[PDB]
Paper text:
Calcium/Calmodulin (Ca2+/CaM)-dependent serine/threonine kinases (CaMKs) constitute a family of 81 proteins in the human proteome that play a central role in cellular signaling by transmitting Ca2+ signals. The N-terminal kinase domain is tethered via an autoinhibitory helix and a calmodulin binding site to a C-terminal oligomerization domain that organizes the enzyme into ring-shaped oligomers.
This non-physiological oligomerization state has been attributed to the absence of the kinase domain. Here we present the oligomerization domains of the human γ and δ isozymes that were refined at 2.7 and 2.8 Å resolution, respectively. The oligomerization domain formed a hexameric structure with a diameter of 120 Å and a height of 60 Å surrounding a central cavity of only 17 Å. Each oligomerization domain in the ring also contains a deep cavity that has been suggested to represent a peptide binding site, based on structural homology with peptide-binding domains present in nuclear transport factors and scytalone dehydratase.
Residue numbers in the entry:
A (entry chain M): 343 to 402, 407 to 471
B (entry chain G), L (entry chain C): 341 to 402, 407 to 471
C (entry chain I): 338 to 402, 409 to 471
D (entry chain N): 336 to 402, 408 to 471
E (entry chain H): 339 to 404, 407 to 471
F (entry chain E): 338 to 402, 408 to 471
G (entry chain F): 341 to 402, 408 to 471
H (entry chain J), K (entry chain D): 342 to 402, 408 to 471
C-alpha cells in the first residue's frame, strides 16, 4: 500500500515538473485527453480537455520550486487513485525577492496500459 | 446506454449525499461516506481534514428552506468500482434580510463502491 | 401590403412577453411554467455567471418570495414562421426599504418558439 | 426517437461551428468577414454600448477600425433549434489574452446569439453579452 | 408687439406652474389632462432611458402619498415661442421641502418642457429634467 | 399614406440633428451658427447648472478644442405644429482615450427646432450626463 | 459725529433685521426688505433669488440664539444709499445639547425710501 | 431710462472684469475706490480693505472668457448702484482642455466726479 | 532681588488661577470683574476671528460632571510695574460621555494690567 | 497720544515680520528679548524659550516672493513701557503648483520698551 | 516503538487541551511544569513565565471541539519530546452559528517521575 | 553554575545558527539542523514544513548590513541531550528608503545533541 | 551575590506595592509611596511632564471588575545606597466591555529614593 | 539652593553632551558616557527593553547622510537622588531637514538615569517615547 501510494506521489511530481519546465508534450502525455479541471484561472467554470491549458504553456530565466505538502492518497480499486495535497510554490517576485504561495490541489489518476494518467483536478487558492 | 446509466448512478448518489447534508442527517451522511474520508473545504481553513470528527460539529450545532442544484456535472468512470464527479453546487437559501439568495461552490467528489454501495472517499469544495 | 403582418406579428411577441412578465410579477409559477419551454435555458444575475437549465432554479424564487414593469424600446426579430426573439429594457418600478418609489433596469433578451399554436420562451438573458 | 438525437446533434454543431467562425472574425479584426456573417439589421446588447440596444454595423465598425495573441473558448454551449431556419446559442465566452504586466490572463462573458438561415447561410440577427 | 410676446410667454409660465402644482398635489387626473398622452421624458428616475406615455409616472403618483409641505419656484424661466401653437420653456426648478432631520432644505433641477396647443388648451409633449 | 408622411417629416428632424452634430464634431462654428437660432438657449454639463444664451458660450469650445463617431440612438420626434418640432435621443459618442483605446460615452439630449424661411433651426437644447 | 452717526444708523438697522430673522417675524422682515430684494445665499444653492417668496418658507416652517455682527464696515454711497459688510457670528445650541458658534460673511445693501432704510440686496457665504 | 442706467452699471462691471483678466492693475485701480472692501475666497473668510491685498495677485500671476450671467442691478439713488450676477469663467486646464467655473458675485458702485467706482465686492465659490 | 521677582510672578499666577476658577464655576459676575471691559480674545470657539468685549463670552456662561484645571509650566513676563503676561499649558480634567475621566489641553496666553490696585485681563489667546 | 502710541507698536510689529520674511536673524535678535517665549504650531504644543529654537528656521530656510498683511490689529497699551498687539497675519506666497495662495494665522505679541527700543518678549501664533 | 512513544505525546497533548477546554486549572497545573514559559497572542509579544498569567483566563472565562491536525512529534532523548500541530477549534459564534478557527502550536514535553509535563509552548495565530 | 553554562551552550549554538542564516551559508545551516527539521514560520503560510528543501530556495535566491539580537532568551534543559530556547529575535537592517530599521519575531527552537553536536530539530517563528 | 539580588528584590517589592495601591484605588497608600514632588511622563498627560500629586488625584477620586498586573522582565539598577531605578513591561489583565478577559501592556520606568528608611517614587515614565 | 541649582546643571550639561555625541554619530564618545549595562526603552526597540551597547551600535555604524540637526532639551526637571545618582526628564525637540527639502521639528518624551562612577557621570538607563 505504501509503495503504491508512492507511485501516485511520484507521478504527481512528474506532472508538476512538466508544468514548471513549460513542457506541453510531457504534460499532454500525463493527462487523459478528456481531463476536466476546476482552477482559479478558469474563473469558476469546469474546463475540459487540453485546449484551455495550451495557452498558458505557449505564452508563458526565473527559478521555481514546488513542494507537494502533506499528500494523502486514496487507492480506489486497482487502476484508480486520488491524491490531495498543499502545493507550495517558491518563486521570485517583481521586487527581485524570493516568495512562497500555496494552493489546495486534488488530482484523480487512472491507469491505462500501465501508465497513470490524470483525469481530473481541482485547485483552489 | 451503459456509460450514460453508470454516470447517472454517481449523480444520483451525489444527490443523496447533498440531501443528507441539507437534512442535517449525520447517520445518513455517515453511511454514504468512507470512514477515512478526506476533505478540502473553506471551513477547514486551508487544511486537509480527515474522518468524520470535523463534520459532526456542523451537523450537531446547525425551518429556513434550502434548495441545491448540481449544475453541469461531469463524471469520470475510473475502473469498475471507482468514479469521480465534478460540478457547480448552487445553493438557494433565505437571507438575513428575509429574501431569497443563491450562492455557489466548485465541488469535486471521489467515489468508491464497497459491497455494492457507492461511498464518498474524498471531496474538495472551493468558494 | 407586406408590413401589415410584420407589425402585427411583432405585437404578438410583445404581448406574450408582457404576459410572461405579468406571471412573474404575480408570482404565478403554474402560469410561468405554461409559457416556458420545459428546457428553458437562462443567463441571469441571480445564477451568478452560470447558464441554468429548466424550471428547478426559478421555482425557488416563486415559492419563497406594488410593482410595475415597463418593456421599453422593444425590438423584435421574426426568425422564420415559428420563431422570434425580442430585446428590450425592462424597467421595474417598486417600493424601497425607505418607503419610497424607485425604478431599476435590466437589459433582457428572450427567444420564443411556437409549439401547437402557443408561443413559448426557450431562452432568456438578463443583465444588470 | 433515436434518429432525431443524431439529427439534432449535427444541427447543433452547425450553430457552434458558425459561432466559432464569427468569434474568429472578431479576433482577426476582419470586418468584411464579420459583415458577411451578421444580418445588416443586427441588434446587440453589450457592455461597450453602456446599457443601450445598438442596431446595425455602424457601432461595431469603430472597434474594428481602431483596435499580443488571443484565444477564445466557447464553454458549455447550449443550442436551441427553433424551427428549420432559426437557432440560438448560449455560452460562456472565455478569452485568454496577454496583460499590461506582460502576463497571460483569462476573462469571461456570458453570451447569447440568435441565428437565422438566409439563402443557405446562417446569419447572426441579435446578440447579448454581459460581463 | 413686445406686449403681445410678454403675455404669450406668461401663458406658458402659467401653464408650467399649474403642471408642477398638479405634481406637488399628487393629482394624476390633473397631470393627465395637461400632458399629451404620448409624452416623452428624460429624468433621473428613468435612469438614462427615454420613457414614453403616462405608465411610468403613474407609479410615482399612486405610491408617493406624502403630510409634509413643499414649495416650488420656477427660477429664471426663458420661453421660446416656436410658431403659434408651440412653445418651450427652460428653467431652474427649486424645491423647498422638509428633510429627515426635521429641517427645511432646498434642492434644484434644470428642466426643459415643450408645449403644444391642441383645441385651445396647452399640453406638455416632452420634458427633460437633470439633477 | 398619412403615416408614411409623419414618418418623412420626422426624418427631416433626425437629418437636421445629424447635420448639427456633424458640424460640432468637425469644429465648424460657421456651420453651427447657421443651424442655430442666434438666441439659442442651452442647458449642458459644461454650463455648470446655468442656462446659457446665445453663441458666446459655445464659441470658446470651437475656437480652443483623433477620430470620433456619434450615434443618435432611439430618437423620438414630436411634431408640434407645421413649423416646430422637438427631438429626444441618447447621443452615443465613440472616441479614442488617453490610454490609446476606443471608448464610448453617452448623454441624454433634447433639441427644439423651429423652421424659419424654409430652414430648420435649433432654438434650445438640454444635454445631461 | 456725522459719518460715525450715519454709519451707526446702518448698523442699527442691520441689527433690527437680524433680530426679526431670529424672532421668526416675517411681517417685520417684510417691512425692512424692499419687495424686490435679491439674495445670494447657501440655501439658494448658487442661484440668485428674487422677492420674498423664497424666504417665506423658512419663516413659516422653522432653543436660544445670539447673533453678533462682527467687524462691520459701512460705506455711505450717497445720501439715500449704504452698504454694510460684516462677519455674522451665530451662537446656538447643538443636537448634542451644547453651545456652538458658526459664521458667515455677509453683505447688505440699503436704500432709504420715505425716511425708512430698506434692504435691497444681500449676499451670504459660508 | 432705468434700462439705460442699468446698462451703464453692467458696462462698467464688464470693464472691471476685463481689467482683471488683462492683469492691468493701473486700470483696476482707476475703477476701484481706494478704500474698496472685499469678501472673497482667497481672503480666507476675512474682509480685506484697500488695494494692497489684490496687488500681489496682479504682480505675480492661456486664453480666458468671462460671462456676466443673469445680472440684476439695483439703482439706489442717483450716484449709487449695486449689481449681482453669476460670473462664469471659461479657461484652459492643466490637462490641456477647456473648462468653465462659476462664482456668485455682488458689486457696489458709487459715482464720483462722473466716473462710476467700485466700493465693495463679495465673491463666493 | 529674585525673591521680589518670584513674588510678583506668583501674583500673576494667582490671579490667572482665580480667573480660571470663575470660568469653571460659571460665575460671569466674577469673570466680568477680573476682565477689562475691552478684553480682546483669540480662541477656537471664535472660529479664527478676534472678538472684543464681554458679549461673546456671556452666551457660554448663560447656557452651559466635576472639572479640574492645572496651569502647567507657567512663564510670566513682568513688563513694567503695572503690566504682565503669562503663558501656560492649560490642562483640563473632566468626565466624558462614556462616563470616564479624560484630560485635554490648550496653549494659553494672557496679558494683565493693574488698574486701581486690581490686576485685570486685557487680552488672551487660546489655541487647541 | 493714543492713536500715535498704537502706531508705534504696529510699526515695530511690521519691522519684525519683515525681518522674518527677509530671513535676517541678526535683525530678529535685536528686536526680540533674549528670553522670548513662544507658542507656535512648529513648536508642537510646547512653550519654547529663547532664540535657539528659531535659529534653525532662519539658518535652513528663497528666490520666491512673499507679502504679509497685518489685518485688523488691536493694540492694548498696558502702562508706559508695555503693549500688546493682536492681529490676523495674512501671508501671500507662491505655491508648489506655481500659483499665488494666501494663508492665515491668529497672532499675539507682547512688547516691552527697554532703553527706548521696543522688544518682543512673548508671542503666540495659532493656525 | 517510535510510533507508540509518539502516540504517548499526542495523547498527553490531547489531555492538556481537554483540561483547557474544560476550564480545569488544577488539571492544567498538574500537566504543566511550574516554570512553563509561553509565547501566545494574548501575551502580546512577550514571553510569559509560570502559571500566574494563565490563571486569570481560567478564573474569568457554548460547546467546543478541538482537533489536533497533522501532528509531528520529535523524540529528543528518552525523557524529552516536542510536538507541532495545527490546532483547529470548532465553536459557536455571536451570530449563533458554528465556526472554525486555527492556530499553529508547538509544545515541549519533559518526563519527570514517569509523568510527561509541558515545559514550553508557542502558539501563533 | 553548571546549569548556567549548559544554558549558554544553547544560546551559543542558536547564535551560530542565526549567523549562518545572515551570512547566507546553507552548508553551515545544514550542519546545524537535523535533516528532518520541522518548522512553523510566516513564509510557510500556516503549514508545517519538513526538511531542508523549503529553506534552500531562500538561501540560493537571497551586501546589506544586518544585525540580530537574541533578546531575553529563556532556555529549558529537558534531559541531558535535549534543550529548547525561546527568545525575541530583533533584526536590525537597512531599508528601501536607505535607512536603518528594526523588526521582531518570537522564536522557539528545540535542540538535540547527537554525537556531541547540538542540532536544531524544530522551530517556530511568528511575527 | 545574594545581597545585590535581595536589594533588587526590595525595589521590585515596593513597585508591586505601588501598583497594588493603584489597582485598589487607594490614594492615601499611593501618596505614602510617592515623593510629594514626583514627576511623570504618561499617556494621559498628553505629552507634558506633570508634577506632584494634583494630576493623579482626579483619576483616583473619579475611577469608581477584577484586574491583575504583572511586572514582566524587571531590570533594576542600584545607583548609590539610597537610589534605584526599575524598568519593566507592565501587563494588565482586565475585563472588557464585551464582558471578556483582555491584556494590555506598557513600558514603565520608575526611579526610587530612600528617605528615612522608606523607598519613595520620585519619577516615572509610562509609554504605550 | 546655590549647590542644588549647580548640581542640577551638571546633569543637564552631561545630558547635552550625550545628545551631542548621538547627533555627531560618535559611538566612542557615546560609549564613554554610557554604563556598559545601559538598559533602554525606545520606539526603535519595538516594545522590548534592550540591554548594553549592541543594539545602538547598528544605528551609529549605518546612519551617515551634510544634513544639519539641532536638539533642544526643553523644560528639564532633575531629581538628585543621593550624592552619586540623578535622573532627568525633558522634552527632546529635534529640528531637522525633511525629504521635501524643508525644516521640521519633532518631539519625544525622554527620561535618563545617571550614576557617577570615579567622578564621571554615566547613563545607566533611558526611556524615550514618541
Amino acid at each position: 500500500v505504501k509503495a503504491r501510494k508512492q507511485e501516485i506521489i511520484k507521478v504527481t511530481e512528474q506532472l508538476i515538473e512538466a508544468i514548471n519546465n513549460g513542457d506541453f508534450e510531457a504534460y499532454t502525455k500525463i493527462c487523459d485527453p478528456g481531463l476536466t479541471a476546476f482552477e482559479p484561472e478558469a474563473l469558476g467554470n469546469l474546463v475540459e480537455g487540453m485546449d484551455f491549458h495550451r495557452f498558458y504553456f505557449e505564452n508563458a530565466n526565473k527559478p521555481i520550486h514546488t513542494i507537494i505538502l502533506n499528500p494523502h492518497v486514496h487507492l480506489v480499486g486497482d487502476d484508480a487513485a486520488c491524491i490531495a495535497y498543499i502545493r507550495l510554490t517558491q518563486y521570485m517576485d517583481g521586487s527581485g525577492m524570493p516568495k512562497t504561495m500555496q494552493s489546495e490541489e486534488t488530482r484523480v489518476w487512472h491507469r491505462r496500459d500501465g501508465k497513470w494518467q490524470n483525469v481530473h483536478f481541482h485547485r483552489s487558492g
